[PDB]
Design a binder for these strands. Structure first.
Ligand SMILES: Nc1ncnc2c1ncn2[C@@H]1O[C@H](COP(=O)(O)OP(=O)(O)OP(O)(O)=S)[C@@H](O)[C@H]1O
Ligand SMILES: Nc1ncnc2c1ncn2[C@@H]1O[C@H](COP(=O)(O)OP(=O)(O)OP(O)(O)=S)[C@@H](O)[C@H]1O
Ligand SMILES: Nc1ncnc2c1ncn2[C@@H]1O[C@H](COP(=O)(O)OP(=O)(O)OP(O)(O)=S)[C@@H](O)[C@H]1O
Ligand SMILES: [Mg+2]
Ligand SMILES: [Mg+2]
Ligand SMILES: [Mg+2]
Lengths: 614, 319, 255, 163
DNA sequence: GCAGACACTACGAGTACAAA
DNA sequence: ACAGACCTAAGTCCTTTGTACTCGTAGTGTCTGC
DNA sequence: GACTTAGGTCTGT
């Protein structure tokens, strides 16, 4: 199919594969472009050298192309483009990329030579306990200082600054925030995807700043009693191992004090009895720095930590930062790695430097050259299967490409059921919320958007029936696959297409909580009025409350401050309270909404009313 | 009688890594780690009976030599694998001192690791890293999704695949030669077909056929092992005429004793796994079988409801 | 190798029971002088040092110096197995992977060999240097245990202020507060009940309660406690043995 | 009583393998298995009242004799389907020897289709580890409830509706 | 006889439920 | 140096039930010491 | 072909 080209032929060219290509999928086109050194970006821009679109382009991206005047080609044009251009990209943009590649290779070689020198020094010391070969590639190449961490440079700088002026903030009693603003908080959290060096960064910053590190695995120790004893006693005591560790030398005054680096804080037990909420009480009073670390910060059990900590989000490092590190480890370990593969490896692993390290360690045992020939199989065997966020499930579920004839073969129906089963508590709600905000692209001939929407709504009603049968006293969970199809897959297939606006979260939860609160309030008022009123709960709201308004709020609107007594009388005729009055006035809808009216009665009448009732 | 012979599944279990037939690349990599040493943390995932426990045990034995008694720790789903075992048993085993060959390390084999509690899995995260210099953890599980992502990050992910018919035929031929069993090519082919890549089921069915009837023939194998239920379900679903499908349901399924719940569930699975039928038609037939499944689970399980389900499916196919 | 024979096995059992609820893992370095071992607490707030000399053992032989990394709870379990009057012989082979405790009774022919697997502990041999102590006190062990246990109920802090010829312990808690004051008295008729004071400089120091009950748990080792107090330095709590001691280095609260 | 004051369903319960009719294939194959001693892990799946419990009880009677109620672990999986049973009763029974006479051990799990997924995931290795001394029998009306793993370690016999 | 001291059993809150 | 310009990594974001399982807290009974 | 928010890195003025 695609003709072969000279190595790094497409170097220095920014190519965006917007259009659908008959022969190659988007991933295949990206791979065949990155094999030759091309740069692929998701946004068409001024610096975009070439846009590849055979057909089926997007109107927004098309408008961007028209405004920016970017040259465009088709798939056959791309095939012609691959072969023609010379090796290594000539053009100045190609020369810049050549210089960058050479510089990265030189840095890798220099650091590999440095590692060889360190190994020789260690061998000389040993001649004069665990052998370095026995160590894993993850630990033998662990960063020894902040200057070797990959990505999140701002995050490590912020942590270093916070821990550095923590002493000054303590002198200021934490009331003053400072220039950076991190000094107000007494504890700091590092949260992000696994394996991006949160623990490494914390250990190294605490080492450089001279404090004595105390590490506690919060998953191992999560009970309230053990947590209390251990770290409550540790929060305000000195370090004996630190006092005896050469306090006589005056360089490090922080050597006595503690930095408690708590790992796997996401593994704490939940609830008031659980220790996840108790540790916030700890951070609310600390004489030593606290560095909590968690993977899933946006987790309900972790709500109490929100306001008592400095939240620091560690993000997945971009491939460019990690290329240099992988090049040093590859030059040292005598396995050939070409840079063009590196990016996809990171995309295979989703920004987990640890798993890329282990991937290279495992694969290099047999295959000594990781190149463009075997990268596809490596990705297909080592790809991370991570449960998508509900927003991503909604995006893929309401996607036209998924339910097309060609897309169905790539993503089978079983895969759509798996997408539902990733999160079985929210996808039915997300689809219900965002099945009517999409421009459809799978409308059958003779069907409008409204017909597909109505069919989808009928299917959601049937899925709600299935869910109730699933989630009731019968507990027919064997219908869970069926609830997969009726609630999520079928309506989305009916209204599949492009996303018109944004993907909103399920509004059902908030309005359901509001309805529960209003039902509770209505129960209180109804049981207060029961001794006089011969009604049920619903009848009161339907009939009496509209009449009760005319006898409660309207006299305040019309006759004036002398209505209080009369109002009080009818109040005392049904055992109403001031809270009862405020609740009744909050039940009306549409034309009779009282929120603006209660603002327009003068404050004198309100104060007199409360005073008279009291 | 008082004593029983070993099943050929356990008697002929591979004791060296070379005997394992399928998934050649992973097995060769495990042999290279076996020779060189320094085995990283690993998670072995796949389908039942493709040699996951056997692979890890061959690797552990070959690595640890005579030190398998002390350096290797079994933990199975049959044992208590809560957070307690991580705190008390796993941590103490990993802290233990033991002098080993220069490259090899102590090995923790956690079989059926998919059933480990979330608390135990989270607690294992730091025991994995702190004591990695001395101990290397190995997990074997059917589903890799059940193991938390932080644990998945620290280990090499090896995914095993279903065994091709050729490898099953080779292993069965070897067992045939060692045990001097009389066979026919049709019987062996039927055994592979019924096994569907599950080598454990292949060996078990072969041994059962030999014991019950004495000759591995197509007739004997099909007598002792039924033809797959999903195949007759698929044939019933994809029938051209309603009467033909009704005949299949009556004779092959209802009269042979298959329960209505089984037919409906297998119909749903065959429908969702079918490829020739277009996705829209598959979804609508899935809806009809879902209605029928609800009716069956509500206590109304009869031939009439299944027949109505097939009639609806044929109406859907007939436009 | 190593072959160290105790006179009596109850001594080792009590020694291990003394400091097993504060630290879980230890390193016993067996030198020609005896068995020296320090353990840093998990909280890194207390340090335990133990020395048992050759005079303690009936027959101690060591060929090459070794360290035995051990778990205190497992050793306590093993020591609970032996009888009170048995002679416990610790025997270790070259490249030790386990220590073979050997309980034996001369009256009968009963022999009990328990092999305790050796734990691999990697920790530094932190150097210990004495300093001039502002206050050195010698008190009865049972008395001190009682004040510590009584005051620990009210609060988690124990404030020892040694004013002129006075030692007062104070605890301030959410519900109630307590104060116990001791005067120094020396009794010729019973030396054990005597209270001994040396005060170069008066001291006031607050110490954590939990570590303090962990310290008082060693009361069985010796009749008298030795408390060395300096304002900016960790406090020493010593329970003296016939050929050694159980030194506890404790860190006070910030003040 | 004298087994005469019992319902005809119970009083006419088969007591020997020769009094079970209809499933001649299964009965003959199992009889040959037990005679040659190569009895695998059995899974009798079929409709109600087709004679699975009677078949396995008569098999235990034939293999062990009259005192089969003390030397076979018969567990009603409906009454106890927890993983605790797998850890405590099933595994201790499989591991130990026999208090009455020498021989292998049989565990008859009745209505195992009610067994919880955790219990079956625990039993899928209890079955494998102690295959030297014990064998497992699984009785089922519905095979969809049972885990796929437990359906690969047991030789399957289908009980046809009675002709 | 009388009081703690671990160790077993009872109670209570949190979480996941499928398919391959 | 500084805002802009590319490019990419990320966040929007909480409902019951029936029964089994687990884990930490609270309660109980029983053994040892004085 | 989803919105806003945000980080890291370059070049130009
Ligand atoms: N940014 C990085 N640069 C270099 N090496 C890294 C980086 N991130 C992770 N590593 C490697 O991965 C190892 C483990 O890093 P960790 O700090 O433990 O990751 P993590 O973010 O704590 O993930 P967890 O433990 O699942 S929350 C380190 O010792 C390094 O070898
Ligand atoms: N690749 C293979 N080569 C040879 N025998 C095999 C192979 N795969 C399975 N077997 C046979 O099947 C038996 C069971 O193997 P296991 O590895 O224990 O199964 P598994 O793959 O671990 O799946 P489980 O046990 O259900 S989690 C072995 O003892 C062999 O007899
Ligand atoms: N094949 C048979 N031969 C003779 N009597 C039989 C046969 N099958 C069933 N019966 C009679 O029916 C009764 C019930 O048999 P069971 O074996 O208990 O039924 P089952 O096969 O276990 O089905 P279940 O209990 O619903 S799973 C027996 O006690 C006999 O009286
Ligand atoms: Mg970490
Ligand atoms: Mg297995
Ligand atoms: Mg029965």
């Amino acid at each position: 199919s695609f003709p072969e080209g000279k190595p790094n032929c497409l170097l220095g060219l920014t190519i965006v594969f917007t259009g659908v290509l008959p022969t190659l999928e988007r991933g295949a086109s990206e791979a065949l472009a990155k094999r030759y050194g091309a740069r692929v970006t998701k946004s068409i821009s001024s610096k975009t050298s070439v846009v590849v679109l055979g057909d089926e382009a997007g109107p927004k991206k098309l408008e961007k192309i028209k405004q920016l005047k970017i040259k465009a080609i088709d798939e056959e044009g791309f095939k012609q483009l691959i072969a023609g251009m010379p090796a290594e990209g000539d053009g100045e943009a190609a020369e810049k990329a050549r210089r960058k590649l050479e510089e990265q290779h030189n840095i890798a070689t220099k650091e590999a030579e440095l590692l060889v020198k360190k190994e020789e020094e260690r061998s000389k010391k040993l001649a004069a306990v665990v052998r370095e070969e026995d160590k894993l590639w993850t630990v033998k190449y662990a960063p020894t200082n902040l200057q070797q961490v990959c990505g999140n440079k701002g995050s490590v700088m912020k942590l270093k600054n916070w821990l550095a002026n923590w002493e000054n903030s303590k002198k200021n009693s934490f009331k003053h925030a400072g220039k950076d603003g991190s000094g107000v908080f007494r504890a700091a959290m590092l949260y992000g995807p696994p394996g991006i060096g949160k623990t490494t960064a914390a250990h190294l910053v605490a080492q450089e700043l001279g404090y004595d590190i105390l590490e506690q695995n919060a998953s191992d120790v999560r009970s309230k009693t053990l947590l209390n004893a251990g770290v409550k006693n540790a929060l305000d005591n000195m370090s004996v191992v630190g006092y005896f560790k050469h306090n006589e030398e005056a360089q490090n005054l922080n050597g006595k004090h503690f930095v408690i680096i708590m790992d796997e804080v996401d593994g704490m037990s939940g609830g008031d009895r659980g220790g996840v909420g108790q540790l916030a009480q700890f951070c609310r009073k600390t004489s030593t720095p606290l560095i909590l670390i968690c993977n899933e910060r946006n987790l309900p059990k972790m709500r109490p930590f929100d306001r008592v900590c400095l939240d620091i989000q560690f993000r997945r490092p971009d491939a460019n930062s990690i290329k240099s590190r992988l090049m040093t480890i590859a030059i040292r370990e005598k396995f050939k790695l070409d840079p063009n593969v590196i990016d996809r490896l990171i995309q295979t692993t989703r920004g987990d430097i640890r798993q890329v390290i282990n991937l290279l360690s495992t694969i290099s045992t047999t295959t000594k050259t990781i190149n463009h020939e075997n990268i596809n199989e490596i990705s297909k065997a080592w790809e991370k299967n991570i449960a998508l966020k509900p927003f991503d499930i909604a995006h893929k579920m309401l996607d036209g490409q998924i339910y097309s004839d060609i897309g169905s073969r790539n993503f089978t129906l079983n895969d759509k059921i798996a997408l539902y089963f990733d999160d079985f508590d929210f996808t039915p709600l997300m689809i219900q919320e965002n099945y009517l905000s999409t421009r459809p692209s799978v409308l059958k001939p003779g069907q409008s958007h409204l017909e597909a929407v109505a069919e989808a709504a009928n299917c959601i009603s049937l899925g709600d029936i299935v869910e109730k049968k699933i989630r009731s006293s019968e507990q027919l969970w064997s219908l869970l696959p069926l609830h997969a199809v009726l609630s999520s897959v079928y309506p989305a297939s009916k209204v599949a297409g492009h996303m018109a606006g944004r993907i909103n979260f399920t509004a059902w939860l908030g309005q359901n909580s509001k309805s529960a609160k209003y039902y509770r309030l209505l129960q209180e008022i109804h049981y207060h009025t029961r001794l006089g009123t011969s009604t049920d709960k619903i009848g009161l709201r339907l009939d009496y409350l509209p009449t009760f308004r005319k006898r409660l709020l309207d006299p305040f609107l019309k006759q004036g401050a002398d209505a209080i007594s009369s109002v009080i009388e009818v109040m005392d005729d049904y055992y109403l309270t001031k809270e009862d009055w405020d609740s009744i006035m909050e039940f009306f809808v549409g034309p009779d909404v009282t929120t603006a009216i209660i603002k327009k009665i003068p404050a004198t009448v309100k104060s007199g009313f409360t005073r008279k009732y009291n | 009688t008082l004593s029983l012979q070993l099943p050929w599944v356990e008697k002929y279990r591979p004791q060296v890594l070379s005997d394992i037939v399928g998934n050649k690349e992973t097995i060769d990599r495990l042999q290279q780690i076996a020779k060189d040493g320094n085995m990283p943390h690993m998670i072995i995932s796949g389908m039942p009976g493709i040699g996951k426990t056997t692979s890890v045990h061959c690797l552990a034995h070959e690595l640890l030599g005579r030190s398998y008694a002390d350096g290797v720790l079994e933990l199975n789903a049959s044992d208590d694998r809560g957070i307690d075992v991580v705190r008390n048993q796993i941590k103490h085993f990993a802290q233990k001192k033991l002098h080993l060959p220069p490259g090899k390390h102590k090995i923790v084999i956690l079989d059926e690791a998919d059933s480990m509690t979330a608390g135990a899995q989270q607690a294992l995260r730091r025991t994995m890293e702190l004591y990695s210099n001395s101990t290397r953890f190995a997990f074997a599980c059917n589903q890799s999704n059940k193991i938390i992502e932080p644990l998945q990050s620290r280990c090499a992910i090896l995914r095993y695949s279903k065994l091709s018919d050729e490898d099953v035929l080779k292993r069965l031929l070897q067992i045939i030669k060692l045990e001097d069993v009389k066979y026919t090519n049709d019987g062996l082919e039927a055994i592979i077909f019924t096994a569907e890549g599950d080598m454990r089921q292949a060996i078990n069915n072969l041994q059962s056929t030999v014991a019950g009837h004495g000759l591995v023939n197509a007739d004997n194998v099909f007598k002792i092992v039924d033809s797959p239920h999903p195949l007759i379900v698929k044939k019933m679903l994809l029938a051209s005429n309603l009467e033909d499908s009704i005949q299949i349901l009556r004779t092959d399924l209802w009269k042979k004793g298959y329960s209505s719940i089984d037919i409906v569930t297998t119909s749903f699975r065959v429908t969702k796994n079918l490829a020739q039928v277009k996705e829209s038609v598959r979804l609508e037939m899935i809806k009809e079988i879902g209605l029928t499944h609800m009716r069956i689970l509500e206590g109304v399980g009869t031939y009439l409801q299944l027949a109505s389900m097939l009639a609806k499916i044929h109406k859907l196919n007939n436009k | 190798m190593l072959e160290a024979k105790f006179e009596e096995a109850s001594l080792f059992k009590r020694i291990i029971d003394g400091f097993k609820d504060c630290v879980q893992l230890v390193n016993f370095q067996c030198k020609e002088d005896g068995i020296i071992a320090q353990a840093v607490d998990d909280s890194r707030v207390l340090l335990v040092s133990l020395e048992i000399g050759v005079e303690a053992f009936q027959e101690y032989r060591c060929d090459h110096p070794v360290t035995l990394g051990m778990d205190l709870t497992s050793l306590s379990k093993i020591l609970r197995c032996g009888n009170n009057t048995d002679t416990l012989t610790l025997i270790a082979d070259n490249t030790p992977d386990s220590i073979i405790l050997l309980f034996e009774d001369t009256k009968k022919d009963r022999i009990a060999e328990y092999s305790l697997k050796l734990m691999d502990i990697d920790a530094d041999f932190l150097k210990i240097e004495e300093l001039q102590y502002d206050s050195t006190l010698s008190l009865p062990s049972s008395e001190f245990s009682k004040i510590v246990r009584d005051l620990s109920q009210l609060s988690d802090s124990i404030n020892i202020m040694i004013t002129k010829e006075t030692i007062k312990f104070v605890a301030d808690g959410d519900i109630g507060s307590g104060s116990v004051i001791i005067k120094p008295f020396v009794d010729m008729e019973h030396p054990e009940t005597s209270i001994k004071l040396e005060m170069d400089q008066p001291v006031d120091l607050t110490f954590g309660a939990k570590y303090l009950l962990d310290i008082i748990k060693g009361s069985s080792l010796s009749d008298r406690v030795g408390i060395r107090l300096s304002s900016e330095a960790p406090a020493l709590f010593q329970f003296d043995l016939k050929s050694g001691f159980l030194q506890f280095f404790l860190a006070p609260k910030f003040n | 009583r004298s087994k005469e004051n019992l319902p005809w369903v119970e009083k006419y319960r088969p007591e020997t393998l020769d009094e079970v009719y209809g499933q001649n294939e299964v009965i003959t194959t199992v009889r040959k298995f037990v005679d040659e001693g190569k009895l695998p892990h059995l899974l009798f799946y079929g409709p109600p009242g087709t004679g699975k419990t009677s078949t396995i009880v008569a098999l235990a009677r034939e293999i062990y004799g009259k005192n089969y109620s003390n030397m076979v672990l018969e567990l009603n999986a409906s009454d106890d389907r927890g993983i605790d049973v797998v850890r405590n009763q099933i595994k201790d029974f499989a591991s130990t020897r026999q208090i009455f006479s020498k021989g292998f051990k049989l565990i008859i799990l009745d209505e195992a289709d009610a067994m919880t997924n955790a219990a079956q995931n625990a039993l899928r290795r209890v079955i494998e580890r102690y295959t030297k001394n014990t064998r497992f029998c699984v009785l089922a009306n519905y095979a969809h409830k049972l885990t796929p793993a437990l359906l690969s370690r047991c030789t399957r016999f289908r009980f046809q509706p009675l002709p």
